[PDB]
Design a protein around this ligand. Structure first.
Ligand SMILES: Cc1cc2nc3c(=O)[nH]c(=O)nc-3n(C[C@H](O)[C@H](O)[C@H](O)COP(=O)(O)O)c2cc1C
Ligand SMILES: [Cl-]
Length: 357
């Protein structure tokens, strides 16, 4: 008799429901990659979520991969995010910041001094990347030196401390979707021969060291980690995802985190001889709160919470188009249809103008 509307204790935070707004890049940052009042309105409109996870936000300038995503590395960015967290709190909500470093998923045109994007290994992604001059081929990223990995961890640590000064309730470490930490996790993108490559413990080392550093800034119950075991996004694949992600789920127990958040790839069942990483494997392996995500509905989300298969259910696409998604789900209202043409960039249209019930 728990469902999507049941309250939940997440550390010291009292969530009114089990509905989470998934992190959604909207590429609507202002000059200097600073959030602004329109962003504050957008998140304030969605404050009925049990928890909002804000869009991926680069922790350092080299961590940007797409034009006009917000950062959390400068004082102006902290002040713009404070507008957002002030508004969400005024509206009675709770919000965590998703901390990002895109690693190889970038272009020199977006990097300081026009440098190469950094990565575990020098493997160019396939296809094209958007720059300020339009789409261009990806370049081959530079493989970080072993001695540079502490600087990466320290960029995440500072990002987390800036998020604390911005007034967030917590942080989510983006270890999913083929970005930097995921690039280290997966053997398709990591062919290093130091203590950060090879065995799973080595490939997970960057994640674990970033997590340790961030739990020295935040109470650990305010730190979450997102994984996406069966995505193929951004050319980042593991050859043994059950072993890799099962190991990671158990290795994170040390830290007493807020949660583990799993994005279940939408094509996992069909773009496999079935799902090779059942979330139940990770649920067994991680001893804390589990957030699931990917194509959820009222019916699917109620099932997973009733069954104890997950504690929280995050919705991405439906929160783009339904600012009051919890109320709509609760009363079985119609749901507004999301318009992909306004997902990224632009202004209020397709962002703050989806109507309330
Ligand atoms: C426009 C858009 C932007 C996204 N940006 C992010 C992001 O910033 N961080 C992230 O971890 N996932 C991101 N995702 C993935 C979503 O959080 C979510 O996992 C995915 O859309 C599947 O959930 P859904 O079926 O409820 O939409 C994005 C998805 C969309 C559609
Ligand atoms: Cl602390």
């Amino acid at each position: 008799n728990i469902n999507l509307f049941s309250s939940y204790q997440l550390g010291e935070l009292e969530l009114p429901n089990r509905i989470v707004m998934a992190p959604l890049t909207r590429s609507r940052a202002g000059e200097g990659n600073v959030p602004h009042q329109l962003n504050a309105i957008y998140y304030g409109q969605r404050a009925s979520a049990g928890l909002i996870i804000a869009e991926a936000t680069q922790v350092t300038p080299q961590g940007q991969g797409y034009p006009h995503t917000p950062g959390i590395h400068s004082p102006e960015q902290v002040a713009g995010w404070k507008l957002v967290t002030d508004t969400v709190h005024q509206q009675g909500g709770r919000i965590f910041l998703q901390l990002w470093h895109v690693g190889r998923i970038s272009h020199p045109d977006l990097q300081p001094d026009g440098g190469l994007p950094v990565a575990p290994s020098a493997i160019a992604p396939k296809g094209e990347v958007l720059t300020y001059e339009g789409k261009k081929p990806y370049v081959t990223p530079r493989a970080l030196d072993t001695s540079e990995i502490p600087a990466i961890v320290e960029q995440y640590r500072q990002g987390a401390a800036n998020a604390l000064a911005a007034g967030f309730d917590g942080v989510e470490i983006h270890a999913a979707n083929g970005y930097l930490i995921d690039q280290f996790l997966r053997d398709g993108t990591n062919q290093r021969t130091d203590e950060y490559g090879g065995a799973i413990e080595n490939r997970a080392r960057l994640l674990l060291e970033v997590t340790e550093a961030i739990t020295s800034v935040w109470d650990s119950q305010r730190v979450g980690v997102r994984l996406s075991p069966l995505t193929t996004l951004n050319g980042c694949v593991d050859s043994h995802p059950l072993e890799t992600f099962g190991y990671v789920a158990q290795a994170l127990n040390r830290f007493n985190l807020s949660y583990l958040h799993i994005f279940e790839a939408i094509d996992a069942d069909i773009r496999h001889g079935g799902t090779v990483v059942p979330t139940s494997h990770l649920r067994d392996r991680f001893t804390g709160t589990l957030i699931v995500n990917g194509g959820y509905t009222r019916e699917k989300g109620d099932t997973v919470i009733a069954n104890k298969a997950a504690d929280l259910v995050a919705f991405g696409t439906l929160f783009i188009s339904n600012p009051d998604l919890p109320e709509r789900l609760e009363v079985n209202a119609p749901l507004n249809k999301a318009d992909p043409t306004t997902f990224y960039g632009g202004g209020e249209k397709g962002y703050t103008d989806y109507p309330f019930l």
